[PDB]
Amino acid sequence: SIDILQEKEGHLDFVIIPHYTFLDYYKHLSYNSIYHKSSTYGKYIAVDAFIKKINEAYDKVKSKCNDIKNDLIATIKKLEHPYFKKMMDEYNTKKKKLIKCIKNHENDFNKICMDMKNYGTNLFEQLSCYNNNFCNTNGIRYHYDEYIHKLILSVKSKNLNKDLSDMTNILQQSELLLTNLNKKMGSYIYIDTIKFIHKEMKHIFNRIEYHTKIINDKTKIIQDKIKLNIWRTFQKDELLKRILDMSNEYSLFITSDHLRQMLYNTFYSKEKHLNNIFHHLIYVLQMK
Amino acid sequence: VKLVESGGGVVQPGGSRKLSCAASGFTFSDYGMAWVRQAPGKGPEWVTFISNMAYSIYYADTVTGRFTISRENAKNTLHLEMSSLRSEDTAMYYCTRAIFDYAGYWYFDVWGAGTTVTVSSAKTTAPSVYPLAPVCGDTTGSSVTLGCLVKGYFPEPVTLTWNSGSLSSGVHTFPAVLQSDLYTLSSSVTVTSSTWPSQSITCNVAHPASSTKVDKKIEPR
Amino acid sequence: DIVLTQSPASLAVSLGQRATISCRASESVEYYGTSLMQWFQQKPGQPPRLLIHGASNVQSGVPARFSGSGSGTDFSLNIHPVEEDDFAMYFCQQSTKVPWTFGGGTKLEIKRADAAPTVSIFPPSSEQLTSGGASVVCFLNNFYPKDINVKWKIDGSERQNGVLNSWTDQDSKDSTYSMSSTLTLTKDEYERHNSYTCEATHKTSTSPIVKSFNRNE
């Protein structure tokens, strides 16, 4: 599934949610693999480089969509700033044209993902212990501390429940401002855009709510599980299954944190557009 | 760091064979492994690859469905089960250790000496050994050249010596060539003219497979 | 399938000189800014030996006189200065896409003085005739360069049928080449012709080296 994001005015990007999770899962496998032994630590330079070459390659496949994406930006530019029928239909076709462009470059995206799976599985396959019945967990401990711990704290320092309460509040206010607002001639083009922006904002809200639930669920699971795989040893097979389980937990957690932030920014970019149209209704036309 | 292939020999067409490879001098389970083959007079041909823990297995289309690579990490052994053997499978079979470079690629660094698989319906046949004396009425020179023709044997090898090994300089033994299932080989010996036939020259051919040893003295025509 | 075309098929060089051998791939062998081109050396009766792996990465233990360059589809192996142990076969190999392919090979051979072949003709042995066969053997020994053309003539007319040829590799001690040519007929056929000839065409002479005999003369 695809998520379209408008973080700043004039900027528009998309994410293939399964691809982001897949690419990230293999990043964790690669790192857990090299951190297990002190002799393989120095391979961080080579792993950082390969992952960077894959992200830049994936970005080069989306950068070859930039024409149709900029065409959608211009349609959004007209919609967001009227100061709606054909404009509403214009928006949906340009949106379906972009979605069609992403499906056409599927083979190009899939291969990079497949190239990352091959690299990740290969590093992981090469994971060896001095004594297979007593595998160290220093790698799991180092990886968590250096790639994951700061993200759990970042989430805990923020208040995402308040963020959803503050988002519903803005949605409640626009619903009230639309209803408890005296009707006026020529305001129709603006009333339709507000009702439209509000719907897109309610859709963005539902996504943020869906992702915050995953962040909250995964933050407890990660913190609980990490305690059980940290200051001990495992038989090789158990160590590997334990690394696989953590990578899946990390990948899902990271993905939706990344998406919540991006959708938070898009809810507020579209909120700036509601403030502007309501300002035009009250000041340029005074609709008490 | 050593790789030792075993299991080679003669296989009749449509037959099967298992090849083993013993690894020593390194942690076998830490490497990807492969079989590469080399047909007589041809370059190497990659046939199959198995990763460290067998997550990745690849095959050449020429071998796909007929050959099976496998490994026993605890016994330091790589296996090759070959099944519907054709004449085209006749080769020196090499076992190779594969390194996964952190730039994301596999390369073969250590190879074993190889093991020969000969896919043929031919029965073991002792060769016909013929003494080749020079032509008559020839002009006088400083040296004479004599020959030996070894025709229709199977399998390789044959051991050809001159005067039971005492004549080695001035000797050219040609690589065996296949003539309709059987091998044929030639050898020449060149000596100072005045010494032959006065100081006799004998060709000796030993074919271990048929447990024969044959002598053929070269006599003037 | 990726087709690696090596050029030249054979290269003759002297001690202390540079040997540059090239390889061309059907399509790019590049994988995220790395050209996955390996180079191997192979001596007779010996397995291949790794020399270079990342198009340019010299293997540990491989001397500094060996170097690799290029990217995409054009690759070259450089040996400078050439040493005695360097005369061998060289293959290139790609590991970008499966099946992993090798080139046909380039034989690096030593340059030496031209040497005309010494040709000897042998009528069938009497032992072979009593068994019903008749092989006429021709030896073409110690020649240089490698390139030679042997034609069989029976009563002045060329015979291509029943010809088996064998060629030795470059000699270790003298750097020359030798060849054996066998024309096999039945005794029935052999007893129907009189003149048997083998003609050698080699750069050492524009005119061929002819060795003949007349049956029963």
Place of tokens 């997550």: B55
Place of tokens 């239909």: A89
Task: Looking at the complex, report in whole angstroms how far the Cα of residue A46 sits from the nearest Cα belonging to chain B.
Answer: 6
Query: Which run of H or E residues covers position B120?
Result: none
Query: How would you classify the pairing of strands B9-11 and B115-119?
Result: parallel
| Residues A197, A84 contacting (CB under 8 angstroms) | no
* C-chain residues near A54 (CB < 8 A): 32
Q: What does the alpha-carbon distance between residue C53 and residue C93 come to, in Å, rounded to a whole number? A: 9
| Residues A156, A222 contacting (CB under 8 angstroms) | no
Q: Is the dihedral of CA C122, C126, C129, C131 positive or negative?
A: negative
Q: Which residue pairs from A262-267 have beta carbons closer than 8 angstroms and sit at least 24 positions apart in sequence?
A: A262/A3, A262/A5, A262/A7, A262/A15, A263/A3, A263/A5, A263/A204, A263/A207, A263/A208, A263/A211, A264/A163, A264/A208, A265/A5, A265/A7, A265/A8, A266/A5, A266/A6, A266/A7, A266/A204, A267/A167, A267/A201, A267/A204, A267/A205, A267/A208
Cβ atoms < 10 Å from Cβ of B124 = 13
Grouping H, G, I as helix, E, B as strand and the rest as coil, residue B88 is helix
- Token representation of residue C67: 């170097």
Q: What does the alpha-carbon distance between residue C68 and residue A271 come to, in Å, rounded to a whole number? A: 59
Mutate to test the interface with B, among A126, A129, A237, A240 (most CBs of B within 10 A): A126
How many inter-chain contacts (B to C, CB under 8 Å) are there? Answer: 145
Q: Are residues B81 and B131 in the same domain?
A: no
Q: What does the alpha-carbon distance between residue A115 and residue A26 come to, in Å, rounded to a whole number? A: 10
| Residues A247, A139 contacting (CB under 8 angstroms) | no
Q: Are residues B66 and B106 in the same domain?
A: yes
Q: Is the dihedral of CA A245, A249, A254, A255 positive or negative?
A: positive
CA nearest to B107 within chain C: C53
CA nearest to A119 within chain B: B104
Determine, for residues C96 and B105 on separate chains, whether the beta-carbon distance falls below 8 Å: yes
Q: What does the alpha-carbon distance between residue A80 and residue A198 come to, in Å, rounded to a whole number? A: 12
Query: How would you classify the pairing of strands B177-179 and B171-173?
Result: unpaired
| Residue of C131, C115, C132 lying closest to C209 (CA atoms) | C115
Q: What does the alpha-carbon distance between residue B201 and residue B219 come to, in Å, rounded to a whole number? A: 8
Q: Which of residues 164-203 of C touch B (CB under 8 A)?
A: 164-168, 178-180, 182, 184
Q: What does the alpha-carbon distance between residue C203 and residue C186 come to, in Å, rounded to a whole number? A: 34
- What does the H/E/C string look like for chain A? CEEEECCCCCCCEEEEHHHHHHHHHHHHHHHHHHHCCHHHHHHHHHHHHHHHHHHHHHHHHHCCCHHHHHHHHHHHHHHHCCCCHHHHHHHHHHHHHHHHHHHHCHHHHHHHHHHHHHHHHHHHHCCCCCCCCCECCHHHHHHHHHHHHHHHHHHHHCCHHHHHHHHHHHHHHHHHHHHCCCCCCCCHHHHHHHHHHHHHHHHHHHHHHHHHHHHHHHHHHHHHHHHHCCCCCECHHHHHHHHHHHHHHHHHHHHHHHHHHHHHHHHHHHHHHHHHHHHHHHHHCCCC
Query: How would you classify the pairing of strands B91-101 and B32-38?
Result: antiparallel
Task: Note the resolution in Å, 1 decimal.
Answer: 2.3
Looking at residue B218, what DSSP letter applies? -
Residue C32 touches partner A, C-beta closer than 8 Å? yes
Burial class of residue B101 (count of CB atoms within 10 Å of its CB; 0-12, 13-18, 19+) = middle
For residue A56, the number of C-alpha atoms closer than 13 Å in the C-beta half-sphere is 8
Indicate the number of domains in chain B: 2
Identify how the structure was determined: X-ray
According to DSSP, the residues that pair with B116 across neighbouring strands are B92
- Token representation of residue A170: 């803005």
Cβ atoms < 10 Å from Cβ of B67 = 22
Q: What does the alpha-carbon distance between residue A265 and residue A7 come to, in Å, rounded to a whole number? A: 5
| Residue of C158, C164, C111, C174 lying closest to C135 (CA atoms) | C164
- Token representation of residue B73: 């990490």
For C15-132, where are the E strands, in sequence order? 19-25, 37-42, 49-52, 66-71, 74-79, 89-94, 101-102, 106-110, 118-122
* B-chain residues near A49 (CB < 8 A): 103
- Token representation of residue B199: 């100081």
Query: Which run of H or E residues covers position C31?
Result: none
Q: What does the alpha-carbon distance between residue C185 and residue C175 come to, in Å, rounded to a whole number? A: 34
Kindly list the structural domains of chain C, giving each domain's residue range(s) and its CATH number in brackets, ordered by start.
1-112 (2.60.40.10), 113-217 (2.60.40.10)
Cβ atoms < 10 Å from Cβ of A39 = 9
- Token representation of residue B80: 């090759």
Q: Are residues B187 and B167 in the same domain?
A: yes
Q: What does the alpha-carbon distance between residue C84 and residue C80 come to, in Å, rounded to a whole number? A: 12
Q: What are phi and psi of A186, to 5 degrees?
A: 80, 0
Q: Which domain holds residue A144?
A: 1-288
| Residues C10, C63 contacting (CB under 8 angstroms) | no
- Whether a cis peptide bond, with omega within 30° of 0, leads into C81 is yes
Cβ atoms < 10 Å from Cβ of B174 = 22
| Residue of A105, A115, A95 lying closest to A30 (CA atoms) | A115
Grouping H, G, I as helix, E, B as strand and the rest as coil, residue C188 is helix
Q: What does the alpha-carbon distance between residue B219 and residue C134 come to, in Å, rounded to a whole number? A: 18
Instruction: Identify the chains in contact with B, defined as 3+ C-beta pairs within 8 A.
Output: A, C
Q: Which of B81, B100, B122 is the last residue in one of the domains?
A: B122
Q: What does the alpha-carbon distance between residue A120 and residue A127 come to, in Å, rounded to a whole number? A: 11
Q: What does the alpha-carbon distance between residue A173 and residue A194 come to, in Å, rounded to a whole number? A: 12
Grouping H, G, I as helix, E, B as strand and the rest as coil, residue C1 is coil
In degrees, rounded to 5, the angle at the alpha carbon of residue A219 between the alpha carbons of residues A218 and A221 is 60
Query: How would you classify the pairing of strands C19-25 and C74-79?
Result: antiparallel
Grouping H, G, I as helix, E, B as strand and the rest as coil, residue B219 is coil
| Residues C49, B111 contacting (CB under 8 angstroms) | yes
Q: Are residues B170 and B192 in the same domain?
A: yes
- What does the H/E/C string look like for C84-113? HHHCCEEEEEECCCCCCEECCCEEEEECCC
| Residues B107, C56 contacting (CB under 8 angstroms) | no
Grouping H, G, I as helix, E, B as strand and the rest as coil, residue B51 is coil
Grouping H, G, I as helix, E, B as strand and the rest as coil, residue B156 is coil
Q: Is the dihedral of CA B95, B101, B104, B105 positive or negative?
A: negative
Tell me how far CA of residue C107 lies from CA of A251, C26, C165, in angstroms. 52, 22, 20
| Residues A218, A105 contacting (CB under 8 angstroms) | no
End-to-end CA distance of chain C: 59
Q: What does the alpha-carbon distance between residue B37 and residue B31 come to, in Å, rounded to a whole number? A: 20
Burial class of residue A199 (count of CB atoms within 10 Å of its CB; 0-12, 13-18, 19+) = exposed
What's the CA dihedral at A206, A212, A217, A220 to 10 degrees? -170
Q: What does the alpha-carbon distance between residue B31 and residue B26 come to, in Å, rounded to a whole number? A: 9
| Residues B203, B187 contacting (CB under 8 angstroms) | yes
Burial class of residue B153 (count of CB atoms within 10 Å of its CB; 0-12, 13-18, 19+) = buried
Tell me how far CA of residue A162 lies from CA of A261, B121, B217, C109, C131, in angstroms. 14, 83, 107, 80, 106
Q: Which domain holds residue B3?
A: 1-122
- Whether a cis peptide bond, with omega within 30° of 0, leads into B175 is no
Burial class of residue A200 (count of CB atoms within 10 Å of its CB; 0-12, 13-18, 19+) = middle
According to DSSP, the residues that pair with C183 across neighbouring strands are C136, C163
Of C95, C133, C178, the CB nearest to B172: C178
What's the CA dihedral at C1, C3, C4, C10 to 10 degrees? 140
Q: What does the alpha-carbon distance between residue C109 and residue C175 come to, in Å, rounded to a whole number? A: 9
Determine, for residues B103 and A128 on separate chains, whether the beta-carbon distance falls below 8 Å: no
CA B53 to chain centre: 32
Query: What length is written for chain B?
Result: 221
Indicate the number of domains in chain A: 1
Q: Are residues B7 and B46 in the same domain?
A: yes
Query: How would you label B199-211 residue by residue, b for 16+ Cβ within 10 Å and e otherwise?
Result: eebbbbbebeebe
Grouping H, G, I as helix, E, B as strand and the rest as coil, residue B203 is strand
Query: What length is written for chain A?
Result: 288
| Residues C37, C136 contacting (CB under 8 angstroms) | no
Neighbouring residues of B65: CB distance < 8 A, sequence distance ≥ 6:
none
Instruction: Identify the chains in contact with A, defined as 3+ C-beta pairs within 8 A.
Output: B, C
According to DSSP, the residues that pair with C40 across neighbouring strands are C50, C91
Q: Is the dihedral of CA A38, A39, A40, A42 positive or negative?
A: positive
Task: Looking at the complex, report in whole angstroms how far the Cα of residue A113 sits from the nearest Cα belonging to chain C.
Answer: 13
Q: What are phi and psi of C38, to 5 degrees?
A: -100, 150
Query: How would you classify the pairing of strands C106-110 and C89-94?
Result: antiparallel
Q: What does the alpha-carbon distance between residue A220 and residue A239 come to, in Å, rounded to a whole number? A: 21
Q: Residue B211 sits in a domain of what CATH number?
A: 2.60.40.10
Q: What does the alpha-carbon distance between residue C148 and residue C143 come to, in Å, rounded to a whole number? A: 9
Q: Is the dihedral of CA A38, A39, A41, A47 positive or negative?
A: negative
Q: What are phi and psi of C87, to 5 degrees?
A: -70, 110
According to DSSP, the residues that pair with B213 across neighbouring strands are B206
| Residues B146, B218 contacting (CB under 8 angstroms) | yes
Neighbouring residues of A278: CB distance < 8 A, sequence distance ≥ 6:
A174, A177, A194
Determine, for residues C33 and A50 on separate chains, whether the beta-carbon distance falls below 8 Å: no
Query: What length is written for chain C?
Result: 217
Tell me how far CA of residue C177 lies from CA of B188, C118, C147, C148, C173, in angstroms. 14, 11, 9, 10, 11
